[PDB]
Design a protein around this motif. Structure first.
Motif, mmCIF file in Angstrom:
data_model
loop_
_atom_site.group_PDB
_atom_site.id
_atom_site.type_symbol
_atom_site.label_atom_id
_atom_site.label_comp_id
_atom_site.label_asym_id
_atom_site.label_seq_id
_atom_site.Cartn_x
_atom_site.Cartn_y
_atom_site.Cartn_z
ATOM 1 N N UNK A 153 37.719 37.311 40.251
ATOM 2 C CA UNK A 153 37.824 38.999 39.306
ATOM 3 C C UNK A 153 36.991 38.193 37.759
ATOM 4 N N UNK A 154 36.596 39.155 38.128
ATOM 5 C CA UNK A 154 35.081 39.276 37.179
ATOM 6 C C UNK A 154 35.051 39.268 36.014
ATOM 7 N N UNK A 155 36.959 38.380 35.585
ATOM 8 C CA UNK A 155 36.957 38.846 34.419
ATOM 9 C C UNK A 155 38.152 37.503 33.901
ATOM 10 N N UNK A 156 37.765 36.596 34.949
ATOM 11 C CA UNK A 156 38.276 35.303 34.386
ATOM 12 C C UNK A 156 37.080 34.608 35.339
ATOM 13 N N UNK A 157 36.936 33.530 34.465
ATOM 14 C CA UNK A 157 35.509 32.810 33.897
ATOM 15 C C UNK A 157 36.069 31.445 34.172
ATOM 16 N N UNK A 158 35.583 30.113 34.794
ATOM 17 C CA UNK A 158 35.815 29.547 34.653
ATOM 18 C C UNK A 158 35.092 28.980 33.566
ATOM 19 N N UNK A 159 35.186 27.578 32.813
ATOM 20 C CA UNK A 159 34.617 26.885 32.245
ATOM 21 C C UNK A 159 34.794 24.936 32.060
ATOM 22 N N UNK A 160 34.235 24.415 31.842
ATOM 23 C CA UNK A 160 34.379 23.491 31.697
ATOM 24 C C UNK A 160 35.601 22.948 30.285
ATOM 25 N N UNK A 161 35.807 24.281 29.709
ATOM 26 C CA UNK A 161 36.500 23.823 28.194
ATOM 27 C C UNK A 161 37.925 24.908 29.026
ATOM 28 N N UNK A 162 37.911 25.020 30.071
ATOM 29 C CA UNK A 162 39.066 25.848 30.915
ATOM 30 C C UNK A 162 39.099 27.014 31.815
ATOM 31 N N UNK A 163 39.912 27.867 32.093
ATOM 32 C CA UNK A 163 39.456 28.713 32.672
ATOM 33 C C UNK A 163 39.496 29.827 30.959
ATOM 34 N N UNK A 164 39.290 31.392 31.014
ATOM 35 C CA UNK A 164 39.017 32.005 29.904
ATOM 36 C C UNK A 164 39.820 33.633 31.285
ATOM 37 N N UNK A 165 40.370 34.499 30.475
ATOM 38 C CA UNK A 165 40.419 36.050 31.081
ATOM 39 C C UNK A 165 39.832 36.459 29.685
ATOM 40 N N UNK A 166 38.789 37.979 30.317
ATOM 41 C CA UNK A 166 38.018 38.591 29.332
ATOM 42 C C UNK A 166 39.102 39.855 29.646
ATOM 43 N N UNK A 167 38.535 40.800 29.075
ATOM 44 C CA UNK A 167 38.514 42.380 29.201
ATOM 45 C C UNK A 167 37.484 43.086 29.180
ATOM 46 N N UNK A 168 37.625 44.142 30.508
ATOM 47 C CA UNK A 168 37.316 45.535 30.763
ATOM 48 C C UNK A 168 36.387 46.281 29.328
#
Ligand SMILES: CC[N+](C)(C)c1cccc(O)c1
Ligand SMILES: CC[N+](C)(C)c1cccc(O)c1
Lengths: 527, 527
Positions: free
Chosen positions: A1-16
């Motif tokens: 999913x385009x709103x789920x991003x994996x970062x060096x700090x943890x996974x982040x869930x955005x919003x459209x």
């Protein structure tokens, strides 16, 4: 999913988020540091401990504790600048707008809000990065930093309240962009930092601070430069205002430790209630807790750094608004009022110049008065009003900025200078205020594209042009894809930014800036 | 006979002089004092011992010993100001032009020649009183006074060379007009004294000196006021320059007596050869031997006299020329030359301002430069030239004069202010010099009426208008028989004097004179 991003700090869930007739992704409220609460108050920020699970980044974060402007209750001209979310010491978060489909490696724009270092919020409506992100296909980042005493209280020498921690907050977020923006489609090597007023000064400070120069590539400074008379104080002054703050809260002043300990026990509003009582002078355009020239963040005086080329060499895009002083006169000079034309008497003018140049001796005040007075019509109320507007703008924003660009351009890789002189058609502030400090911002962020805000067609075009200029410059170091000329020390060209066909001019307010940059300073030193 | 006049000093025989298509009487070269030769050199003048027989007053007298301008050999622009008769220490004489038939009791006009107190002659062609006498039915008197060291050497405290004796020479002639002008058809109670440049300053000084105020009724000051920076020196300075003069002539400097004795043995030209070597500074528009503020002729400082109303209250008519500084730049500033356009470099400008304001510190020089520099075009040669012209004129003539009129008008009975901005059509001086110092004079004396001088028709008219304005004002205290407005401290109106339809303006060069009268002086005192 385009709103789920994996970062060096943890996974982040955005919003459209819907934008004009499309949508884009938004990651709102990503923590980039440990909450600076409890005994962390006044301390340098700490990197945010990595988290487990998905971080919900669908809603704006809290705003930092700050003085709330209640001078015009319910008036949008001023409330639009006020915190629009719960205020909290836990406010070190960042927001990201990402084009949809998520880009692979695009230009990153990091917005640093202004507000005299005492106020500011990343969540304001005028700071909504979706139109810019969406229109110019840039990854738009907006950060937050501690303002007021919370971000700038400085007890130089102590580590509990070293000073500049609000600048470190910005650095930290810049650090996090550097390290994680690639996961959002952004290119960490083409990060442009841009800000207005204290944000613009912040930008210039990051350009000067050794510890910050590697975190970004290009800079955009709007109505603010690091050498503005209100952007920093000495460590001695920073110390004096800290004690004074303690004095106002009946703190033990026997030691830094006792002083700081007392200040950490106070509730946030208690510090904010007495914040303006520590200014050393009766004045306008002066804020209490600002960056200190500490020897750390800033190795030496800003001026020696500027003279010796001790700063990051890159491309910079900067400018000023036509009536930078108007806003401050309105809130602190006698004779000005929102609902009148504010025709100013010679008595009010004279007291106005005194508030404007608080450090000048009488001779200095006389030099200012002579310079800005039409002696063929010294009782003209409009002329006194306007002359005062120029005094405040010239001394606090335009001439310090002009000095900066002239010092910078000797060593930099490209200077682009604008003069924004367009008054929005839907402005609710009185006409006498002109092209007000902070009012280029809605144009930079593309508000004129949302029809329901009622800007003119020509204003939509100007916004698009400014956005394209800003995004193009961030992308390639040059605003141009007629032409916005390079600013050179010899030709000093700059452009106008208004609904009319851009015109190229030279030497922005030379006459006056020679007065403020060379003559007045020499005068006050002599006397 | 109309050419034989009986006076309290003896009988005088004039001569009939043709004027335009008529004639008038002229009594040229009447002695009004004992010849100030031998051990009388430097002494106050002595009333002329009555004589027996008829004094032949048919030919101009000698001119006082003075520096002769040889800067442009054979050039009329400058030679016309030079002595046109043998030079001699025996030069205290006066000339009278009387209408024919001899009037019974008409307005008397007494001309006092200017020339920086170092030069001047009553016999110049431009000073020919016949056109004015004849046209306005006034008795025109022109006096002479000792110039240079001979009239202004001042060894305050000594009686052998007290200082101001050239001012006493004027007084003496005024005394003689007072006492004998009734025999020429003139009314000793309606005597107007008028002069240009040092003559104008002389006039204002007579207005201030208690011992002179009763000798005349009204005053006309042309491009000169008593408070001009070059019109007087302290007694200490007067003394220093006297010693320096002695030093230059290898005089015993052990005592005033020895010093003066040495100076009386010197031949006139010897004193003139070294006269300019005693100025204390490298400068323009500064003369060596000028009136000293001695405590006698001038009871206190001119400024305290001006502030307290300590001066004769009457009507005054005064003004300035548009380009008062041009002449002095030409003779002493680098970059100016008669035959070029004198475009001035920024290097030459800076050295120009230094010569112009010799007493200023660097800050003062900076204040002047800031004030007169167009920083949007600081390399413009025309602008630097012109700016320098204004600097010299504003500081030496216009602003001191404006200060005088504003102090005077608080206590006086009528101030009329003109601005002469007409460049004669037949001027031989380069165009860049503009409306040159001293060039209103030919208009006041009606030279434009003599066709063979080739003035335009419009210039004839302007001369007639100026002559009528001057004569009418002398006659009634008001230039008017559109209207030349009264100058008031509130309205500050003044008129233009040119071939175009007079226009009324307000606040002559306010902006600059506030700089010269208030700000610069405050600056130099502070620093
Ligand atoms: C113009 C309003 N704004 C929030 C941007 C603001 C507030 C205080 C000081 C500033 O320089 C700017
Ligand atoms: C302009 C020539 N003139 C003889 C009148 C002259 C000479 C020296 C100084 C002056 O102020 C005026």
């Amino acid at each position: 999913s385009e709103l789920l991003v994996n970062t060096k700090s943890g996974k982040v869930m955005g919003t459209r988020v819907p934008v004009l007739s499309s949508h884009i992704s938004a990651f709102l409220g990503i923590p980039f540091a440990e909450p600076p609460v409890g005994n962390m108050r006044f301390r340098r920020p700490e990197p945010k401990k990595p988290w487990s699970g998905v971080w919900n980044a669908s809603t704006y974060p809290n705003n930092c504790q700050q003085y709330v402007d209640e001078q015009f209750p319910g008036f949008s001209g001023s409330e639009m600048w006020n915190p629009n979310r719960e205020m909290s010491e836990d406010c070190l978060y960042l927001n990201i707008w990402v084009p949809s489909p998520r880009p692979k490696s695009t230009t990153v724009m990091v917005w640093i809000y202004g507000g005299g270092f005492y106020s500011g919020s990343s969540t304001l409506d005028v700071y909504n990065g979706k139109y810019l992100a969406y229109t110019e296909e840039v990854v738009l980042v907006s950060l937050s930093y501690r303002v007021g005493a919370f971000g700038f209280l400085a007890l130089h020498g102590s580590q509990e309240a070293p000073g500049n921690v609000g600048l470190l907050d910005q650095r930290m977020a810049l650090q996090w962009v550097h390290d994680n923006i690639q996961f959002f489609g952004g290119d960490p090597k083409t990060v442009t930092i841009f800000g207005e007023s204290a944000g613009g000064a912040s930008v210039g400070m990051h350009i000067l601070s050794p510890g910050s120069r590697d975190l970004f590539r290009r800079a955009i400074l709007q109505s603010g430069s690091p050498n503005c008379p209100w952007a920093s104080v000495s460590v001695a002054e920073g110390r004096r205002r800290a004690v004074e703050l303690g004095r106002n809260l009946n703190c033990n002043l026997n030691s830094d430790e006792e002083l700081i300990h007392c200040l950490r026990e106070k509730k946030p509003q208690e510090l904010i209630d007495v914040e303006w009582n520590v200014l050393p002078f009766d004045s306008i355009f002066r804020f209490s807790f600002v960056p200190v020239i500490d020897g750390e963040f800033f190795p030496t005086s800003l001026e020696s750094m500027l003279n010796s080329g001790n700063f990051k060499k890159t491309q910079i895009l900067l400018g000023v608004n036509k009536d930078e002083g108007s806003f401050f006169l309105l809130y602190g000079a006698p004779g000005f009022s929102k609902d009148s034309e504010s025709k100013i008497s010679r008595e009010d003018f004279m007291s106005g110049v005194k508030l404007s140049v608080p450090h000048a001796n009488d001779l200095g005040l006389d030099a200012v008065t002579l310079q800005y007075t039409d002696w063929m019509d010294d009782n003209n109320g409009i002329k006194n009003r306007d002359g005062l507007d120029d005094i405040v703008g010239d001394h606090n924003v335009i001439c310090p900025l002009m000095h900066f660009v002239n010092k910078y351009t000797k060593f930099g890789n490209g200077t682009y200078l604008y003069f924004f002189n367009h008054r929005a058609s839907n402005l609710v502030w009185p006409e006498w205020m002109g092209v007000i400090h902070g009012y280029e911002i809605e144009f930079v962020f593309g508000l004129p594209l949302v029809k329901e805000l009622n800007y003119t067609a020509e204003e939509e075009a100007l916004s698009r042009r400014i956005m394209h200029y800003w995004a193009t410059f961030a992308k390639t170091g040059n605003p141009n894809e007629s032409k916005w000329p390079l600013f050179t020390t010899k030709e000093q060209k700059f452009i106008d930014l208004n609904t009319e066909p851009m015109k190229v001019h030279q030497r922005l307010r030379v006459q006056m800036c020679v007065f403020w940059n060379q003559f007045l300073p020499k005068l006050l030193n002599a006397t």
